[PDB]
Amino acid sequence: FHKIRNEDLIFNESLGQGTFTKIFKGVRREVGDYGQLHETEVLLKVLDKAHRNYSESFFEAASMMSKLSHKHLVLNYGVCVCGDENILVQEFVKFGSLDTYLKKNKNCINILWKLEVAKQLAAAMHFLEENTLIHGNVCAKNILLIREEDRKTGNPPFIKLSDPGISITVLPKDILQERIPWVPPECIENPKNLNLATDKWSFGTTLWEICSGGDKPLSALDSQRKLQFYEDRHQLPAPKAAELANLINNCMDYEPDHRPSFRAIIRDLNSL
């Protein structure tokens, strides 16, 4: 990771929080192509001082994904360690997380839009699967909308997948249980069961989010009832747009080894 000086970064408005992170819009001053001076909008992710023990996990996940390059994976510019804080410096995506966008535009998004987004997400996961890289935190919040659909241009929306954040192999059990049903049942049984099959399950949950206008599945259940959900082997109800219900339940298979490959997922998406 390129190290960026604190002096080249301006912190602007808070954009909220992630897991043990604060999120800010910012600006980075840089010498760009042809020696031209640039002021680039950037997305700053700050690992809170209180959770400094988690520093290594957050930056190792960002780092391993950034060693790959792909059109559906977010760009990291570097890190800023010059100070009291550990900061990831990331490209600023104009429209933000998908879950927020879905809620704000529920009445204006149709099935073709959702399919286009699901295909792009599967393409990114296929790429990661072929490179045997585990993301570990696939969710609508971690999907970024680069561009909206422009009916007058025929151009479709474009999304990117954000960095994994802290690994579920090191998170507290309370956060893990609260992340049901994105976290697979076998990772609740044992966080060290993190595997490629993990991302197949979370892809299904994310698909449910997309098909549900940005609702959070099982949000009415507290932590103990979310555990009970897995104990009794329940499946999510069919979302509003039910066309993807079968794919969702196929991905959310309690048997990790029976979950389909993303190649097969893409074939099924393409059959609609």
Contact positions toward ligand M4P, by CB under 6 A? Answer: 15, 18-19, 21, 23, 43, 74, 90-93, 96-97, 141-142, 144, 162, 165
By the 10 Å C-beta count (0-12 exposed, 13-18 middle, 19+ buried), 241 is classed as middle
Strands (E), 101-227: 143-147, 158-161
Q: Are 95 and 146 in contact (CB under 8 A)?
A: yes
Residue 233 beta carbon to ligand M4P: minimum distance, rounded to whole angstroms: 27
Residue 147 beta carbon to ligand M4P: minimum distance, rounded to whole angstroms: 13
Q: Are 198 and 188 in contact (CB under 8 A)?
A: no
> Residue with CB nearest ligand M4P?
18
Instruction: Compare residues 137 and 212 and give the one whose CB is closer to ligand M4P.
Output: 137
Residue 268 beta carbon to ligand M4P: minimum distance, rounded to whole angstroms: 27
Beta bridge partners of 54: none
Instruction: Compare residues 28 and 253 and give the one whose CB is closer to ligand M4P.
Output: 28
Instruction: Compare residues 53 and 228 and give the one whose CB is closer to ligand M4P.
Output: 53
Q: Are 191 and 198 in contact (CB under 8 A)?
A: no
Instruction: Compare residues 160 and 200 and give the one whose CB is closer to ligand M4P.
Output: 160
Instruction: Compare residues 8 and 91 and give the one whose CB is closer to ligand M4P.
Output: 91
Residue 48 beta carbon to ligand M4P: minimum distance, rounded to whole angstroms: 11
91 closest CA partner among 27, 148, 150, 38: 27
Instruction: Compare residues 76 and 253 and give the one whose CB is closer to ligand M4P.
Output: 76
Cα–Cα distance for residue pair 216/205, rounded to 1 Å: 9
Q: Are 195 and 185 in contact (CB under 8 A)?
A: no
Would you state the structure tokens that stand for residue 193, as one six-digit string?
């069961």
Residue 23 beta carbon to ligand M4P: minimum distance, rounded to whole angstroms: 5
Q: Are 159 and 95 in contact (CB under 8 A)?
A: no
Instruction: Compare residues 73 and 248 and give the one whose CB is closer to ligand M4P.
Output: 73
Which residue is listed with tokens 């996961």? 125
Residue 151 beta carbon to ligand M4P: minimum distance, rounded to whole angstroms: 22
The DSSP call for residue 124 is H
Q: Are 262 and 129 in contact (CB under 8 A)?
A: yes
Residue type present at position 38: H
Residue 164 beta carbon to ligand M4P: minimum distance, rounded to whole angstroms: 9
